[PDB]
Amino acid sequence: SSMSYSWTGALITPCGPEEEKLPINPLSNSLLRYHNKVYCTTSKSASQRAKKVTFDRTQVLDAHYDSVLKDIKLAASKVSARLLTLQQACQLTPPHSARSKYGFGAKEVRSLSGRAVNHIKSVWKDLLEDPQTPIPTTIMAKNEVFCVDPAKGGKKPARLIVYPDLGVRVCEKMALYDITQKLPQAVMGASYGFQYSPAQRVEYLLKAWAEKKDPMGFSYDTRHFDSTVTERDIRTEESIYQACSLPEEARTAIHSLTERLYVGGPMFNSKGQTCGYRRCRASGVLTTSMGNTITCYVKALAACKAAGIVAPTMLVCGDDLIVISESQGTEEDERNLRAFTEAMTRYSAPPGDPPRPEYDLELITSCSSNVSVALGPRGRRRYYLTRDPTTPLARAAWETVRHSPINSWLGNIIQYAPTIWVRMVLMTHFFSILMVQDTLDQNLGGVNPLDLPAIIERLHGLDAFSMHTYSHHELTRVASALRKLGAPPLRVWKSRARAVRASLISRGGKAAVCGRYLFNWAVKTKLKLTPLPEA
RNA sequence: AAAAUUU
RNA sequence: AAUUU
Numbered sequence: 001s002s003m004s005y006s007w008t009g010a011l012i013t014p015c016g017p018e019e020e021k022l023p024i025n026p027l028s029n030s031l032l033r034y035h036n037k038v039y040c041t042t043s044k045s046a047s048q049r050a051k052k053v054t055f056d057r058t059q060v061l062d063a064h065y066d067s068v069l070k071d072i073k074l075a076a077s078k079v080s081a082r083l084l085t086l087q088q089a090c091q092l093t094p095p096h097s098a099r100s101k102y103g104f105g106a107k108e109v110r111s112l113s114g115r116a117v118n119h120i121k122s123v124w125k126d127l128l129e130d131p132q133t134p135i136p137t138t139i140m141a142k143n144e145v146f147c148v149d150p151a152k153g154g155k156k157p158a159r160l161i162v163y164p165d166l167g168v169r170v171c172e173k174m175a176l177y178d179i180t181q182k183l184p185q186a187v188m189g190a191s192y193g194f195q196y197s198p199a200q201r202v203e204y205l206l207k208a209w210a211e212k213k214d215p216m217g218f219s220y221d222t223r224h225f226d227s228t229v230t231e232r233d234i235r236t237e238e239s240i241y242q243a244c245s246l247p248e249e250a251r252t253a254i255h256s257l258t259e260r261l262y263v264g265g266p267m268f269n270s271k272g273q274t275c276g277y278r279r280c281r282a283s284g285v286l287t288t289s290m291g292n293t294i295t296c297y298v299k300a301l302a303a304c305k306a307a308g309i310v311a312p313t314m315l316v317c318g319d320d321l322i323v324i325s326e327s328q329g330t331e332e333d334e335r336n337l338r339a340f341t342e343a344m345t346r347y348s349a350p351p352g353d354p355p356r357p358e359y360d361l362e363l364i365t366s367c368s369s370n371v372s373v374a375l376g377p378r379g380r381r382r383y384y385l386t387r388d389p390t391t392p393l394a395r396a397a398w399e400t401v402r403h404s405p406i407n408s409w410l411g412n413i414i415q416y417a418p419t420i421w422v423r424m425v426l427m428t429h430f431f432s433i434l435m436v437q438d439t440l441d442q443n444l445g446g447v448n449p450l451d452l453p454a455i456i457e458r459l460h461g462l463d464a465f466s467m468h469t470y471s472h473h474e475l476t477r478v479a480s481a482l483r484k485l486g487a488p489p490l491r492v493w494k495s496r497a498r499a500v501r502a503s504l505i506s507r508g509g510k511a512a513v514c515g516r517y518l519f520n521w522a523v524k525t526k527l528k529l530t531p532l533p534e535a
Numbered sequence: 536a537a538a539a540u541u542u
Numbered sequence: 543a544a545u546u547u
């Protein structure tokens with residue numbers, strides 16, 4: 001029936017110039033050697049991406065879908081949710097959000113400039129006066145950085161971003177933000193994945209696994225999920241939004257946004273030309289995560305019931321999920337997962353890689369991460385969250401005139417502090433760099449390097465500084481990724497760390513704490529690391 | 536471009 | 543600001 005896109009033939013123009021790396025990457029040329037592998041997806045590649053995501057959809061629902069959907073509205077109606085004052089919505093706008101076509105940008109919106117506020121008022125009138133006229137959208141390519149992978153293609157084509165003018169974005173917020181805050185949690189309960197910390201993901205997954213007499217797990221992801229979303233799916237999304245308690249004024253705006261923005265519309269490139277027309281999810285709308293998550297959750301629970309999955313326990317973050325089920329023997333488990341996949345495909349959410357049942361928690365990847373295990377100080381098992389380091393290390397090497405990766409380094413250090421690759425590689429480099437710069441004191445992205453031991457303990461527990469005997473998988477994968485990027489192997493990082501440490505210690509102060517906590521793995525005679533007053 | 540988490 | 547979807 002519905003085609004996901006149609007294309008005029010107009011280019012997908014760049015929204016400003018997309019920078020090149022330089023001949024010298026001074027911050028990262030001691031991190032790794034193979035900078036030729038580190039690239040940023042350009043708008044040149046956008047054409048290819050479109051070809052991949054433009055395709056015909058044929059949804060076919062059934063009793064299981066219909067029944068799940070029913071249950072989800074009886075959930076929805078316990079939610080009452082309100083409008084957001086034009087002002088409050090303006091306040092929620094990000095500081096650097098792309099400026100409006102009508103001569104104002106996010107400074108003005110957040111500072112409640114008069115021109116901005118009027119224009120927004122008029123936009124919201126038109127939403128109320130008019131529930132059919134399609135709202136124009138802009139289409140741009142996303143700039144992510146990756147390592148090349150000649151296994152899976154050379155270089156990925158750029159993801160497509162589709163969004164309305166800033167005025168419309170504010171209005172969306174007025175109508176829906178409150179919903180986004182309440183609905184999913186209400187509908188999916190514990191299954192709603194974006195509620196949890198990394199640590200709670202891990203505990204949740206473990207509680208799940210442990211509760212089964214004979215657990216079986218698997219993950220699923222949908223291929224180009226946004227383009228698999230059907231006009232109908234979106235309307236079904238609306239009909240769930242509506243199922244709450246709502247100011248009549250909302251309903252009108254929601255319904256109006258649904259029909260004018262969410263189910264489709266014309267797309268324009270940055271140069272102004274008509275680019276195509278869209279009949280699936282737009283990436284750049286307020287409802288994207290909520291939508292994806294809810295919709296994916298419906299289809300998945302339906303597919304679960306179709307396929308026979310016993311005692312499923314789910315976790316959903318957008319198009320990504322994990323189900324931990326009672327195993328029905330491998331012969332049947334293989335059969336049920338085929339069924340699941342057929343069902344999902346009938347619902348128009350077919351997978352990239354077909355899923356597979358697994359019976360070891362380390363072998364289930366989702367949202368690009370997984371659970372692994374190591375031993376802590378007293379010799380007990382410690383489960384934690386990790387991931388292939390390839391991309392993090394690639395992004396660690398993205399240095400241009402505009403961009404510096406030092407923030408990225410730190411970002412990953414915090415999120416993945418217990419991982420062997422953060423502890424041995426990133427930390428070591430990060431500190432080594434700042435000691436030489438002599439810029440330990442400086443707060444980066446509103447965080448101070450010398451707090452780190454505190455911040456990590458607060459978040460990952462003290463065992464994060466004492467962990468050892470990492471898993472085969474994890475050692476194999478780290479080593480492999482360092483070779484791939486032309487980085488020194490771990491033995492070399494051991495050396496560099498020892499040096500960084502001694503130097504950190506000798507400097508004394510909050511420094512020497514860092515030296516002693518963060519790098520205790522690096523030394524022959526370990527130390528009695530005790531809790532830190534701060535967290 | 537949007538959200539969530541982390542800070 | 544970091545990461546993810």
Ligand SMILES: C[C@@]1(F)[C@H](O)[C@@H](COP(=O)(O)OP(=O)(O)O)O[C@H]1n1ccc(=O)[nH]c1=O
Pocket residue numbers: 221222223224225226227281283284288289292318319547
């Ligand atoms: C565009 C999506 F709908 C996308 O289709 C969906 C699923 O994410 P995934 O990373 O699996 O990518 P695809 O499924 O290939 O789109 O999540 C949304 N998404 C993703 C990446 C992103 O920077 N922003 C975003 O809004």
Ligand SMILES: [Cl-]
Pocket residue numbers: 375376377378379380381463
């Ligand atoms: Cl322990």
Ligand SMILES: [Mn+2]
Pocket residue numbers: 221222223224225319
């Ligand atoms: Mn996907």
Ligand SMILES: [Mn+2]
Pocket residue numbers: 238255
């Ligand atoms: Mn309606």
Ligand SMILES: [Mn+2]
Pocket residue numbers: 221222318319320547
């Ligand atoms: Mn995904």
